[PDB]
Structure formats: C-alpha cells, structure tokens
C-alpha cells in the first residue's frame with residue numbers, strides 16, 4: 001500500500017552524494033517493507049551552477065517524476081517519493097495542489113526555500129522551491145499551492161529578505177522548539193496532508209545533508225509528527241537530501257535513523 005518513487009537524475013545537485021543517498025534510502029525501504037521502487041532519471045555529476053542553467057538541465061527528470069507521482073496520487077496508495085534534492089518538489093507540489101486543492105503541505109526544512117530569482121544571493125534552485133510552488137516565480141513546472149495552505153516546520157536562520165516574502169505571502173512558520181504534535185495538528189486542522197522533508201531540518205551530526213543549520217529538530221520530533229498525523233489523512237511523503245555515499249558506513253547509519261522516524265506512517269501503510 002506504499003508506492004515508492006525514486007529520483008536519480010540531477011536536479012541542481014551541488015553536493016556529491018545526494019543521488020547515492022536517495023538510492024540507499026530507497027533500498028532500505030524496499031528491504032523493510034517489501035517494495036519495488038520506481039526509479040526515474042539518469043545520474044549526472046554535481047556542479048555549483050546557477051538555477052537558470054540547472055533548471056533547464058533537470059526538465060526530463062522533473063517531467064518523469066511528475067508523471068509517476070501523478071499516477072500514484074490518482075490512486076489509493078501512500079505516495080512516497082525519495083528525492084535526491086528538494087528541488088524535485090518543484091514538479092510534485094503543483095501536482096499535489098491540483099489533485100488535492102484542500103491539502104495542507106507540511107514543508108519540513110531548516111530553511112524557508114522561499115527565495116525568488118530577484119532575491120537569491122546563491123543562485124541555488126533548492127532555495128527557491130516553496131516560492132516556486134506557490135507561484136511567486138515561474139519555474140516552468142506549474143504552481144497552484146496556496147501559501148495559506150503551506151506550513152514551514154523547523155525553519156530557522158531565515159534572512160530578512162526571505163522572511164519578508166514569507167510574511168507577505170502568509171506562509172506560517174513553526175520553529176523547531178515549537179514543532180510538537182499539538183502545533184502540527186493545529187496547523188493541518190481538518191485537511192488532507194502532504195509532508196515534504198529536507199534532512200537539513202535536523203540538528204546537525206546525525207544525518208548528513210547539504211546544509212548545516214544549528215539548533216534543529218530532533219529525530220524524535222519528526223517521529224512524533226508521523227505518529228500524530230492520522231493515516232486516513234496522509235496523502236504522501238517526500239524524503240530529500242541524504243548526502244552520503246551509497247556504500248558508506250554513514251549511509252547505513254543514516255537510513256536506520258530515517259526508518260525509525262518514518263515508521264509510524266509507513267507501518268500503517270505497509
């Protein structure tokens with residue numbers, strides 16, 4: 001009752017091992033839950049490039065993920081996307097918002113990912129994902145997510161230019177110390193729920209991601225979110241940005257923590 005989709009094409013990756021980390025996470029889920037992943041996209045080396053070149057390069061992978069996610073969302077399984085980078089959500093979030101216009105998105109992330117081409121100082125596509133899905137800028141992959149239905153969970157050291165866009169759009173922010181079961185349940189109210197997680201939300205030192213933001217959420221807080229959301233309301237879950245070689249000891253330890261965090265939801269759907 002889980003549909004596993006795995007991105008393996010480059011989508012703006014600047015870190016070296018996020019494709020391998022997605023592959024390793026997928027394999028752990030296949031072994032634990034008896035699944036067969038649907039693998040999409042062809043790998044490519046990482047690079048420190050501007051969004052205006054990385055985004056066109058990623059079109060084929062993004063369209064293939066959109067197609068697979070749409071097929072799963074139309075049916076009754078729990079849609080689970082294991083994504084190399086959070087930028088895959090530029091393709092999936094518009095599908096979620098079109099299919100489930102009543103859904104609330106829990107965007108669980110150490111950053112706000114709310115920059116636009118005008119505000120970004122890095123040029124990094126991964127910092128523009130949520131603003132793209134909400135239509136503040138045109139990614140070429142659609143929009144349609146109402147910012148009133150998007151909730152940033154765990155975000156912290158947000159710069160003031162990005163915080164200004166967040167407040168103007170009306171995106172709610174729950175900081176890590178406040179991201180308890182009660183607060184997340186208050187945020188989703190009575191709506192179907194989509195969860196999109198970037199592992200940089202966590203306190204650094206456990207799961208290697210791309211960015212290291214101090215004073216993050218603990219793994220037990222993530223598990224408490226998955227325990228609190230009723231299975232009947234959970235549409236799907238995206239897991240992004242494990243940065244570890246697929247053959248490494250660290251990828252093995254990291255997937256163990258990941259499996260523990262997601263077990264309340266995935267066990268219910270298994």
Ligand SMILES: [Mg+2]
Nearest residue numbers: 075076077235
């Ligand atoms: Mg469903």
Ligand SMILES: [Mg+2]
Nearest residue numbers: 074098099100
């Ligand atoms: Mg329909």
Ligand SMILES: [Mn+2]
Nearest residue numbers: 110111198200
């Ligand atoms: Mn992040």
Ligand SMILES: [Mn+2]
Nearest residue numbers: 086109113198
């Ligand atoms: Mn992110």
Ligand SMILES: [Mn+2]
Nearest residue numbers: 198200210241
């Ligand atoms: Mn990240």
